[PDB]
Structure formats: C-alpha cells, structure tokens
mmCIF file of N, CA and C in Angstrom:
data_model
loop_
_atom_site.group_PDB
_atom_site.id
_atom_site.type_symbol
_atom_site.label_atom_id
_atom_site.label_comp_id
_atom_site.label_asym_id
_atom_site.label_seq_id
_atom_site.Cartn_x
_atom_site.Cartn_y
_atom_site.Cartn_z
ATOM 1 N N UNK A 1 4.685 7.290 2.759
ATOM 2 C CA UNK A 1 3.360 6.871 3.248
ATOM 3 C C UNK A 1 3.168 7.242 4.723
ATOM 4 N N UNK A 2 1.937 7.627 5.109
ATOM 5 C CA UNK A 2 1.605 7.854 6.510
ATOM 6 C C UNK A 2 1.432 6.519 7.258
ATOM 7 N N UNK A 3 1.412 6.567 8.577
ATOM 8 C CA UNK A 3 1.227 5.371 9.434
ATOM 9 C C UNK A 3 2.388 4.413 9.174
ATOM 10 N N UNK A 4 3.562 4.959 8.847
ATOM 11 C CA UNK A 4 4.726 4.146 8.547
ATOM 12 C C UNK A 4 5.605 3.975 9.795
ATOM 13 N N UNK A 5 5.020 4.243 10.941
ATOM 14 C CA UNK A 5 5.702 4.104 12.221
ATOM 15 C C UNK A 5 5.335 2.772 12.859
ATOM 16 N N UNK A 6 6.322 2.116 13.480
ATOM 17 C CA UNK A 6 6.140 0.821 14.142
ATOM 18 C C UNK A 6 6.010 -0.294 13.080
ATOM 19 N N UNK A 7 6.940 -1.256 13.104
ATOM 20 C CA UNK A 7 7.083 -2.259 12.055
ATOM 21 C C UNK A 7 5.950 -3.272 12.006
ATOM 22 N N UNK A 8 5.048 -3.229 12.979
ATOM 23 C CA UNK A 8 3.889 -4.133 12.933
ATOM 24 C C UNK A 8 2.859 -3.628 11.954
ATOM 25 N N UNK A 9 2.436 -4.498 11.015
ATOM 26 C CA UNK A 9 1.481 -4.130 9.946
ATOM 27 C C UNK A 9 0.239 -3.390 10.492
ATOM 28 N N UNK A 10 -0.158 -2.359 9.771
ATOM 29 C CA UNK A 10 -1.264 -1.502 10.197
ATOM 30 C C UNK A 10 -2.580 -2.294 10.376
ATOM 31 N N UNK A 11 -2.872 -3.193 9.461
ATOM 32 C CA UNK A 11 -4.076 -4.018 9.575
ATOM 33 C C UNK A 11 -3.962 -4.979 10.750
ATOM 34 N N UNK A 12 -2.726 -5.445 11.003
ATOM 35 C CA UNK A 12 -2.489 -6.342 12.131
ATOM 36 C C UNK A 12 -2.605 -5.589 13.460
ATOM 37 N N UNK A 13 -1.993 -4.396 13.520
ATOM 38 C CA UNK A 13 -2.026 -3.601 14.746
ATOM 39 C C UNK A 13 -3.458 -3.253 15.118
ATOM 40 N N UNK A 14 -4.286 -3.010 14.089
ATOM 41 C CA UNK A 14 -5.684 -2.686 14.307
ATOM 42 C C UNK A 14 -6.433 -3.900 14.892
ATOM 43 N N UNK A 15 -6.048 -5.076 14.424
ATOM 44 C CA UNK A 15 -6.681 -6.311 14.852
ATOM 45 C C UNK A 15 -6.332 -6.629 16.311
ATOM 46 N N UNK A 16 -5.120 -6.292 16.717
ATOM 47 C CA UNK A 16 -4.706 -6.505 18.108
ATOM 48 C C UNK A 16 -5.166 -5.360 18.989
ATOM 49 N N UNK A 17 -5.200 -4.143 18.434
ATOM 50 C CA UNK A 17 -5.744 -2.994 19.152
ATOM 51 C C UNK A 17 -7.208 -3.239 19.494
ATOM 52 N N UNK A 18 -7.833 -4.057 18.680
ATOM 53 C CA UNK A 18 -9.228 -4.424 18.827
ATOM 54 C C UNK A 18 -9.463 -5.406 19.956
ATOM 55 N N UNK A 19 -8.381 -5.973 20.451
ATOM 56 C CA UNK A 19 -8.436 -7.090 21.402
ATOM 57 C C UNK A 19 -7.152 -7.162 22.186
ATOM 58 N N UNK A 20 -6.545 -6.042 22.588
ATOM 59 C CA UNK A 20 -7.069 -5.023 23.484
ATOM 60 C C UNK A 20 -8.573 -4.619 23.437
ATOM 61 N N UNK A 21 -8.963 -3.793 22.463
ATOM 62 C CA UNK A 21 -10.140 -2.909 22.603
ATOM 63 C C UNK A 21 -11.398 -3.589 23.152
ATOM 64 N N UNK A 22 -11.737 -4.767 22.626
ATOM 65 C CA UNK A 22 -12.934 -5.475 23.036
ATOM 66 C C UNK A 22 -12.898 -5.912 24.517
ATOM 67 N N UNK A 23 -11.696 -5.991 25.081
ATOM 68 C CA UNK A 23 -11.532 -6.442 26.459
ATOM 69 C C UNK A 23 -11.408 -5.276 27.426
ATOM 70 N N UNK A 24 -11.302 -4.056 26.920
ATOM 71 C CA UNK A 24 -11.180 -2.886 27.761
ATOM 72 C C UNK A 24 -12.571 -2.261 27.955
ATOM 73 N N UNK A 25 -12.823 -1.721 29.129
ATOM 74 C CA UNK A 25 -14.085 -1.043 29.408
ATOM 75 C C UNK A 25 -14.065 0.382 28.899
ATOM 76 N N UNK A 26 -13.318 0.589 27.797
ATOM 77 C CA UNK A 26 -13.133 1.885 27.151
ATOM 78 C C UNK A 26 -12.689 2.938 28.161
ATOM 79 N N UNK A 27 -11.817 2.550 29.081
ATOM 80 C CA UNK A 27 -11.399 3.461 30.153
ATOM 81 C C UNK A 27 -10.067 3.056 30.804
ATOM 82 N N UNK A 28 -9.748 1.776 30.730
ATOM 83 C CA UNK A 28 -8.542 1.273 31.386
ATOM 84 C C UNK A 28 -7.282 1.788 30.662
ATOM 85 N N UNK A 29 -7.223 1.538 29.369
ATOM 86 C CA UNK A 29 -6.119 2.029 28.578
ATOM 87 C C UNK A 29 -4.870 1.196 28.720
ATOM 88 N N UNK A 30 -4.978 0.148 29.524
ATOM 89 C CA UNK A 30 -3.904 -0.798 29.758
ATOM 90 C C UNK A 30 -4.425 -2.006 30.490
ATOM 91 N N UNK A 31 -3.777 -3.122 30.275
ATOM 92 C CA UNK A 31 -4.147 -4.365 30.957
ATOM 93 C C UNK A 31 -3.145 -4.705 32.015
ATOM 94 N N UNK A 32 -3.604 -5.139 33.168
ATOM 95 C CA UNK A 32 -2.743 -5.539 34.262
ATOM 96 C C UNK A 32 -2.077 -6.888 33.927
ATOM 97 N N UNK A 33 -1.017 -7.230 34.665
ATOM 98 C CA UNK A 33 -0.313 -8.483 34.471
ATOM 99 C C UNK A 33 -1.212 -9.682 34.275
ATOM 100 N N UNK A 34 -2.043 -10.049 35.266
ATOM 101 C CA UNK A 34 -2.994 -11.157 35.153
ATOM 102 C C UNK A 34 -3.858 -11.045 33.897
ATOM 103 N N UNK A 35 -4.385 -9.853 33.633
ATOM 104 C CA UNK A 35 -5.250 -9.639 32.463
ATOM 105 C C UNK A 35 -4.521 -9.965 31.171
ATOM 106 N N UNK A 36 -3.342 -9.358 31.002
ATOM 107 C CA UNK A 36 -2.533 -9.577 29.822
ATOM 108 C C UNK A 36 -2.157 -11.041 29.689
ATOM 109 N N UNK A 37 -1.720 -11.650 30.806
ATOM 110 C CA UNK A 37 -1.286 -13.041 30.832
ATOM 111 C C UNK A 37 -2.434 -13.990 30.505
ATOM 112 N N UNK A 38 -3.665 -13.600 30.904
ATOM 113 C CA UNK A 38 -4.813 -14.425 30.649
ATOM 114 C C UNK A 38 -5.056 -14.593 29.151
ATOM 115 N N UNK A 39 -4.959 -13.494 28.418
ATOM 116 C CA UNK A 39 -5.137 -13.530 26.966
ATOM 117 C C UNK A 39 -3.958 -14.217 26.315
ATOM 118 N N UNK A 40 -2.761 -14.026 26.904
ATOM 119 C CA UNK A 40 -1.564 -14.694 26.452
ATOM 120 C C UNK A 40 -1.649 -16.216 26.632
ATOM 121 N N UNK A 41 -2.289 -16.633 27.732
ATOM 122 C CA UNK A 41 -2.446 -18.056 28.032
ATOM 123 C C UNK A 41 -3.293 -18.748 26.952
ATOM 124 N N UNK A 42 -4.208 -17.990 26.333
ATOM 125 C CA UNK A 42 -5.121 -18.580 25.374
ATOM 126 C C UNK A 42 -4.450 -18.851 24.024
ATOM 127 N N UNK A 43 -3.138 -18.679 23.980
ATOM 128 C CA UNK A 43 -2.375 -19.000 22.796
ATOM 129 C C UNK A 43 -2.027 -20.481 22.804
ATOM 130 N N UNK A 44 -2.088 -21.098 23.971
ATOM 131 C CA UNK A 44 -1.716 -22.500 24.159
ATOM 132 C C UNK A 44 -0.213 -22.701 23.935
ATOM 133 N N UNK A 45 0.543 -21.630 24.096
ATOM 134 C CA UNK A 45 1.989 -21.705 23.966
ATOM 135 C C UNK A 45 2.628 -22.050 25.324
ATOM 136 N N UNK A 46 3.872 -22.587 25.307
ATOM 137 C CA UNK A 46 4.583 -22.957 26.522
ATOM 138 C C UNK A 46 4.875 -21.766 27.435
ATOM 139 N N UNK A 47 4.772 -21.984 28.727
ATOM 140 C CA UNK A 47 4.990 -20.922 29.723
ATOM 141 C C UNK A 47 6.410 -20.353 29.618
ATOM 142 N N UNK A 48 7.362 -21.230 29.291
ATOM 143 C CA UNK A 48 8.750 -20.789 29.095
ATOM 144 C C UNK A 48 8.816 -19.667 28.052
ATOM 145 N N UNK A 49 8.142 -19.866 26.937
ATOM 146 C CA UNK A 49 8.110 -18.879 25.863
ATOM 147 C C UNK A 49 7.233 -17.694 26.258
ATOM 148 N N UNK A 50 6.150 -17.954 26.948
ATOM 149 C CA UNK A 50 5.256 -16.902 27.433
ATOM 150 C C UNK A 50 5.997 -15.944 28.323
ATOM 151 N N UNK A 51 6.757 -16.485 29.289
ATOM 152 C CA UNK A 51 7.542 -15.661 30.190
ATOM 153 C C UNK A 51 8.649 -14.916 29.450
ATOM 154 N N UNK A 52 9.203 -15.566 28.432
ATOM 155 C CA UNK A 52 10.216 -14.964 27.595
ATOM 156 C C UNK A 52 9.661 -13.787 26.804
ATOM 157 N N UNK A 53 8.506 -14.006 26.175
ATOM 158 C CA UNK A 53 7.853 -12.955 25.397
ATOM 159 C C UNK A 53 7.424 -11.813 26.321
ATOM 160 N N UNK A 54 6.969 -12.162 27.509
ATOM 161 C CA UNK A 54 6.585 -11.148 28.513
ATOM 162 C C UNK A 54 7.767 -10.268 28.854
ATOM 163 N N UNK A 55 8.893 -10.912 29.193
ATOM 164 C CA UNK A 55 10.118 -10.203 29.576
ATOM 165 C C UNK A 55 10.589 -9.300 28.433
ATOM 166 N N UNK A 56 10.388 -9.779 27.204
ATOM 167 C CA UNK A 56 10.752 -9.010 26.007
ATOM 168 C C UNK A 56 9.813 -7.846 25.789
ATOM 169 N N UNK A 57 8.521 -8.072 26.022
ATOM 170 C CA UNK A 57 7.500 -7.070 25.773
ATOM 171 C C UNK A 57 7.560 -5.937 26.780
ATOM 172 N N UNK A 58 7.376 -6.246 28.062
ATOM 173 C CA UNK A 58 7.327 -5.219 29.094
ATOM 174 C C UNK A 58 8.695 -4.513 29.180
ATOM 175 N N UNK A 59 8.771 -3.313 28.659
ATOM 176 C CA UNK A 59 10.025 -2.601 28.445
ATOM 177 C C UNK A 59 10.648 -2.142 29.761
ATOM 178 N N UNK A 60 9.836 -1.852 30.758
ATOM 179 C CA UNK A 60 10.383 -1.352 32.047
ATOM 180 C C UNK A 60 10.069 -2.307 33.170
ATOM 181 N N UNK A 61 9.545 -3.488 32.796
ATOM 182 C CA UNK A 61 9.134 -4.515 33.732
ATOM 183 C C UNK A 61 8.255 -3.963 34.848
ATOM 184 N N UNK A 62 7.079 -3.471 34.449
ATOM 185 C CA UNK A 62 6.138 -2.887 35.407
ATOM 186 C C UNK A 62 5.114 -3.941 35.820
ATOM 187 N N UNK A 63 4.635 -4.688 34.844
ATOM 188 C CA UNK A 63 3.561 -5.630 35.093
ATOM 189 C C UNK A 63 2.248 -5.144 34.521
ATOM 190 N N UNK A 64 2.336 -4.242 33.542
ATOM 191 C CA UNK A 64 1.147 -3.729 32.867
ATOM 192 C C UNK A 64 1.419 -3.624 31.371
ATOM 193 N N UNK A 65 0.533 -4.153 30.579
ATOM 194 C CA UNK A 65 0.660 -4.066 29.111
ATOM 195 C C UNK A 65 -0.415 -3.119 28.574
ATOM 196 N N UNK A 66 0.037 -2.001 27.997
ATOM 197 C CA UNK A 66 -0.860 -1.057 27.375
ATOM 198 C C UNK A 66 -1.317 -1.612 26.028
ATOM 199 N N UNK A 67 -1.991 -0.793 25.240
ATOM 200 C CA UNK A 67 -2.430 -1.212 23.919
ATOM 201 C C UNK A 67 -1.233 -1.483 23.034
ATOM 202 N N UNK A 68 -0.242 -0.614 23.123
ATOM 203 C CA UNK A 68 0.982 -0.742 22.346
ATOM 204 C C UNK A 68 1.727 -2.007 22.738
ATOM 205 N N UNK A 69 1.826 -2.228 24.032
ATOM 206 C CA UNK A 69 2.586 -3.349 24.568
ATOM 207 C C UNK A 69 1.882 -4.666 24.240
ATOM 208 N N UNK A 70 0.567 -4.623 24.275
ATOM 209 C CA UNK A 70 -0.249 -5.792 23.990
ATOM 210 C C UNK A 70 -0.094 -6.194 22.531
ATOM 211 N N UNK A 71 -0.152 -5.218 21.622
ATOM 212 C CA UNK A 71 0.041 -5.453 20.206
ATOM 213 C C UNK A 71 1.409 -6.095 19.944
ATOM 214 N N UNK A 72 2.418 -5.565 20.642
ATOM 215 C CA UNK A 72 3.766 -6.120 20.575
ATOM 216 C C UNK A 72 3.784 -7.574 21.026
ATOM 217 N N UNK A 73 3.213 -7.812 22.198
ATOM 218 C CA UNK A 73 3.191 -9.159 22.793
ATOM 219 C C UNK A 73 2.467 -10.180 21.886
ATOM 220 N N UNK A 74 1.256 -9.879 21.482
ATOM 221 C CA UNK A 74 0.507 -10.810 20.643
ATOM 222 C C UNK A 74 1.168 -11.012 19.301
ATOM 223 N N UNK A 75 1.840 -9.975 18.799
ATOM 224 C CA UNK A 75 2.554 -10.088 17.533
ATOM 225 C C UNK A 75 3.702 -11.084 17.672
ATOM 226 N N UNK A 76 4.307 -11.114 18.858
ATOM 227 C CA UNK A 76 5.372 -12.091 19.155
ATOM 228 C C UNK A 76 4.777 -13.499 19.263
ATOM 229 N N UNK A 77 3.581 -13.578 19.833
ATOM 230 C CA UNK A 77 2.845 -14.827 19.877
ATOM 231 C C UNK A 77 2.569 -15.327 18.449
ATOM 232 N N UNK A 78 2.228 -14.394 17.561
ATOM 233 C CA UNK A 78 1.964 -14.737 16.152
ATOM 234 C C UNK A 78 3.232 -15.283 15.505
ATOM 235 N N UNK A 79 4.370 -14.688 15.831
ATOM 236 C CA UNK A 79 5.657 -15.176 15.322
ATOM 237 C C UNK A 79 5.890 -16.621 15.782
ATOM 238 N N UNK A 80 5.611 -16.879 17.057
ATOM 239 C CA UNK A 80 5.746 -18.220 17.625
ATOM 240 C C UNK A 80 4.761 -19.175 16.970
ATOM 241 N N UNK A 81 3.539 -18.687 16.713
ATOM 242 C CA UNK A 81 2.546 -19.467 15.999
ATOM 243 C C UNK A 81 2.993 -19.772 14.593
ATOM 244 N N UNK A 82 3.616 -18.802 13.940
ATOM 245 C CA UNK A 82 4.106 -18.942 12.580
ATOM 246 C C UNK A 82 5.309 -19.919 12.553
ATOM 247 N N UNK A 83 5.838 -20.233 13.734
ATOM 248 C CA UNK A 83 6.939 -21.170 13.819
ATOM 249 C C UNK A 83 8.269 -20.501 13.485
ATOM 250 N N UNK A 84 8.325 -19.190 13.685
ATOM 251 C CA UNK A 84 9.527 -18.432 13.408
ATOM 252 C C UNK A 84 10.285 -18.163 14.708
ATOM 253 N N UNK A 85 11.629 -18.154 14.654
ATOM 254 C CA UNK A 85 12.451 -17.970 15.834
ATOM 255 C C UNK A 85 12.347 -16.566 16.421
ATOM 256 N N UNK A 86 12.282 -16.502 17.746
ATOM 257 C CA UNK A 86 12.228 -15.213 18.452
ATOM 258 C C UNK A 86 13.651 -14.685 18.638
ATOM 259 N N UNK A 87 13.825 -13.354 18.584
ATOM 260 C CA UNK A 87 15.117 -12.750 18.789
ATOM 261 C C UNK A 87 15.491 -12.711 20.276
ATOM 262 N N UNK A 88 16.815 -12.674 20.578
ATOM 263 C CA UNK A 88 17.318 -12.591 21.948
ATOM 264 C C UNK A 88 17.079 -11.208 22.563
ATOM 265 N N UNK A 89 17.037 -10.212 21.673
ATOM 266 C CA UNK A 89 16.745 -8.846 22.085
ATOM 267 C C UNK A 89 15.708 -8.270 21.162
ATOM 268 N N UNK A 90 14.886 -7.362 21.663
ATOM 269 C CA UNK A 90 13.848 -6.768 20.859
ATOM 270 C C UNK A 90 14.419 -5.636 19.999
ATOM 271 N N UNK A 91 13.970 -5.505 18.743
ATOM 272 C CA UNK A 91 14.415 -4.448 17.870
ATOM 273 C C UNK A 91 13.579 -3.185 18.002
ATOM 274 N N UNK A 92 14.161 -2.004 17.726
ATOM 275 C CA UNK A 92 13.452 -0.722 17.774
ATOM 276 C C UNK A 92 12.290 -0.680 16.787
ATOM 277 N N UNK A 93 12.321 -1.585 15.851
ATOM 278 C CA UNK A 93 11.271 -1.738 14.842
ATOM 279 C C UNK A 93 9.918 -1.987 15.523
ATOM 280 N N UNK A 94 9.953 -2.721 16.619
ATOM 281 C CA UNK A 94 8.744 -3.122 17.304
ATOM 282 C C UNK A 94 8.647 -2.460 18.678
ATOM 283 N N UNK A 95 9.513 -1.519 18.960
ATOM 284 C CA UNK A 95 9.463 -0.774 20.222
ATOM 285 C C UNK A 95 8.672 0.504 20.038
ATOM 286 N N UNK A 96 7.544 0.659 20.772
ATOM 287 C CA UNK A 96 6.668 1.834 20.676
ATOM 288 C C UNK A 96 7.381 3.124 21.082
ATOM 289 N N UNK A 97 6.905 4.263 20.542
ATOM 290 C CA UNK A 97 7.473 5.576 20.858
ATOM 291 C C UNK A 97 7.349 5.908 22.354
ATOM 292 N N UNK A 98 8.211 6.831 22.813
ATOM 293 C CA UNK A 98 8.246 7.266 24.222
ATOM 294 C C UNK A 98 8.871 6.196 25.122
ATOM 295 N N UNK A 99 8.630 4.931 24.809
ATOM 296 C CA UNK A 99 9.183 3.835 25.617
ATOM 297 C C UNK A 99 10.582 3.465 25.127
ATOM 298 N N UNK A 100 11.086 4.227 24.168
ATOM 299 C CA UNK A 100 12.400 3.996 23.581
ATOM 300 C C UNK A 100 13.467 4.742 24.363
ATOM 301 N N UNK A 101 13.035 5.537 25.333
ATOM 302 C CA UNK A 101 13.945 6.260 26.215
ATOM 303 C C UNK A 101 13.289 6.484 27.573
ATOM 304 N N UNK A 102 13.877 5.915 28.618
ATOM 305 C CA UNK A 102 13.330 6.075 29.948
ATOM 306 C C UNK A 102 14.441 6.337 30.972
ATOM 307 N N UNK A 103 14.566 7.614 31.357
ATOM 308 C CA UNK A 103 15.523 8.010 32.363
ATOM 309 C C UNK A 103 14.956 9.027 33.312
ATOM 310 N N UNK A 104 14.601 8.573 34.485
ATOM 311 C CA UNK A 104 14.005 9.459 35.508
ATOM 312 C C UNK A 104 15.126 9.979 36.438
ATOM 313 N N UNK A 105 16.343 9.951 35.934
ATOM 314 C CA UNK A 105 17.510 10.442 36.685
ATOM 315 C C UNK A 105 18.291 11.420 35.838
ATOM 316 N N UNK A 106 18.819 12.476 36.452
ATOM 317 C CA UNK A 106 19.485 13.527 35.729
ATOM 318 C C UNK A 106 20.761 14.016 36.448
ATOM 319 N N UNK A 107 21.023 13.471 37.641
ATOM 320 C CA UNK A 107 22.143 13.926 38.456
ATOM 321 C C UNK A 107 23.459 13.941 37.704
ATOM 322 N N UNK A 108 23.888 15.137 37.316
ATOM 323 C CA UNK A 108 25.153 15.373 36.616
ATOM 324 C C UNK A 108 25.632 16.783 36.966
ATOM 325 N N UNK A 109 26.678 16.896 37.742
ATOM 326 C CA UNK A 109 27.165 18.207 38.157
ATOM 327 C C UNK A 109 28.691 18.294 38.029
ATOM 328 N N UNK A 110 29.141 18.938 36.962
ATOM 329 C CA UNK A 110 30.550 19.152 36.739
ATOM 330 C C UNK A 110 30.794 20.425 35.941
ATOM 331 N N UNK A 111 30.826 21.563 36.638
ATOM 332 C CA UNK A 111 31.159 22.848 36.049
ATOM 333 C C UNK A 111 31.079 23.946 37.101
#
C-alpha cells in the first residue's frame, strides 16, 4: 500500500495536519515554541507530561514544531488522552523522515 510511511494513521495525520493547517497563514510551515505549546496547553494535560512530550517530540531541541512534529506531538497527547502509557524513548515508527539522521559534523582524517 502507498502512504505506508510513518506509523501515525493517515486519516489521523490529516486531521492533525489540518490543525496545524487551520492555524498556519499558509506560509509559516512550522509553529514556534509558544505557538505549539499554546495548542498543547488546550489539551488540559499536566505540564509535567506536556514538557515530557515536548522533549520527546522536538528531535533536535530547537523550539519549533513543524507539521510533522506537530502531528507527532498531538498524537502523543492523544495517547495520553487514551490513557495509554508513554514510552521512555521515541520509536522510529513515529519519527519523521530526514529527522532520523542529523550530523552537521564530518571531521574524520586518517589516511
């Protein structure tokens, strides 16, 4: 099947991409820390878990959640809403492409 990438359900990802989408001026392409946290706050979940989910979501700890990162974050909120336990580490199942490898360093000289 196509669209078999990323373990978050296609209908679900569309629903979160939408909100992202409804909150973006069709130009930002990412939400800043406060912006992301504002929507996260509307879950009525504990800040302890919110900070935990944030730390889990933001893969490079930048302070910006893109559409992919937002879908990840809210999906984790959904898990917490569902009353299901959160993992100590995030699985590659829910890690978006390109963000699965980040190395801006190459210094290796032996030959």
